[PDB]
Paper text:
S. aureus encodes a 2,271-residue SRRP termed serine-rich adhesin for binding to platelets (SraP), that is involved in the pathogenesis of infective endocarditis. S. aureus SraP, a surface-exposed serine-rich repeat glycoprotein (SRRP), is required for the pathogenesis of human infective endocarditis via its ligand-binding region (BR) adhering to human platelets. We determine the 2.05 Å crystal structure of SraPBR, revealing a rod-like tandem organization of four discrete modules: a legume lectin-like module, a module with a β-grasp fold, and two tandem cadherin-like modules that create the rigid stem of SraPBR. Further structural and biochemical analyses reveal that the legume lectin-like module specifically binds to N-acetylneuraminic acid (Neu5Ac), which may mediate adhesion to host sialylated receptors.
Residue numbers in the entry: 251 to 751
Write the structure that this text describes.
Amino acid sequence: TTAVTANTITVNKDNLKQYMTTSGNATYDQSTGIVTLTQDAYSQKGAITLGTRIDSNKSFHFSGKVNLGNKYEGHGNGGDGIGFAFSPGVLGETGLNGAAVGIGGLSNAFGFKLDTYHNTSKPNSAAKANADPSNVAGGGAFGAFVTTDSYGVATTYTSSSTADNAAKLNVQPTNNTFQDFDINYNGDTKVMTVKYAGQTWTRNISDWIAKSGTTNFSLSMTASTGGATNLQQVQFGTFEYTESAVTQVRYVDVTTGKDIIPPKTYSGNVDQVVTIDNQQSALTAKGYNYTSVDSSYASTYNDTNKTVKMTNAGQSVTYYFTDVKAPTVTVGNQTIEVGKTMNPIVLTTTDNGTGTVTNTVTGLPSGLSYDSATNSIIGTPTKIGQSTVTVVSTDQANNKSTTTFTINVVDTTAPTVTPIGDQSSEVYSPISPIKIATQDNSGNAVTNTVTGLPSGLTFDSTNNTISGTPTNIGTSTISIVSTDASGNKTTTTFKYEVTRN
Ligand SMILES: OC[C@H]1O[C@@](CO)(O[C@H]2O[C@H](CO)[C@@H](O)[C@H](O)[C@H]2O)[C@@H](O)[C@@H]1O
Ligand SMILES: [Ca+2]
Ligand SMILES: [Ca+2]
Ligand SMILES: [Ca+2]
């Protein structure tokens, strides 16, 4: 087996903390997926960043909701807004507070902002942002693409097309409600489509990607307040992307080719050297011994130091282990009744491994068999006695155990006897012989003894009949005791009346 070197991941509210990191004033509510980036208070800054580089040769997609606040330019003291930034620089870094709207401060980056505070006059040098454009001045929050230069200075993107020009929001933030927000990037066309509360911005971003000097990016979502404020929040929702600059590490059963424990993904910046873990002690605890390392999908791997060096493309290292623990069968001793269909004895087996376990069974009583399909001893035992049953349990790695238990086939069921009706016949007349018919679960001989016979009548053990000529008028109770080989007994009776002619 071989896995992909770069996964296509979806970040959701439950795995968010596995893939992303909050910083500054940001907090997170896992039950709702709500990242609160700032509260409605002065001088706040909060961010969330994705801990793996995104490959822009593949599609990526944020689908969620955003609360931009409840006041904005010309309608309350609202700011600063929320920035969604894609940076060619290192993971974990965020843009600046203020007019930079979380994008200014990052070099050669691009992104999209929702901007509630119109910075009409030129921000100072330290703000790393040009003024907001005239075409969105005069009232209302607006949305826009943003790009930065090599000094980290943000320019709000404007154009002569309504497709991607900076534009006032159709749905203004008046009441702290969450609106639908979507950033969709198509890795085939390089077109980024941003949608906020039904309003769309669309642009081919091939040029900004080329200007950034790379095809793999660090994603941040950052909001701030200064003297102007707002509750600013992003709700997950989901973020889908394909990894760049990762190494996959798998822990694989050499016999089956299956993952023994979950694989691990290490992330870094391009050229970052990262130590990976072969998890030997965890595999040992699971009954596995180290076998080898295959690093053919990670040419940067150094087995002495256990390091890889991240590249744009994903790498993969596989550690192989061998299952060195035999399976266990637990089966207690059994007592079953001869000539009855037994309820199955399930040969309950457990094993530490990833493959198939095969049981082979010997020493079964006659009539019993091992059913593979149900892993059970089934059948009807035909013979009294005790057997030692041996079960040899073999896993796919050829670890073997053998277990024995006893099956005692017993007879505790008494014979059954066809009923004989009460009889009547004339004194001194020979009778039609009365047949005594028995059956038993042992399938073996039932022996009968008979008492209480009218005088002149005889029981014959050879063919189990009563016959003869009765010589006394009167009434008899004939008593038959039927015994199997095990000593189980049945008493059957009937009345015999000897009459006058
Ligand atoms: O309140 C506006 C007033 O405050 C100043 C600081 O003196 O700027 C702060 O407020 C702005 C809006 O929240 C931010 O853009 C800025 O980063 C923050 O320092 C004044 O510059 C501004 O006029
Ligand atoms: Ca602004
Ligand atoms: Ca095993
Ligand atoms: Ca019996």
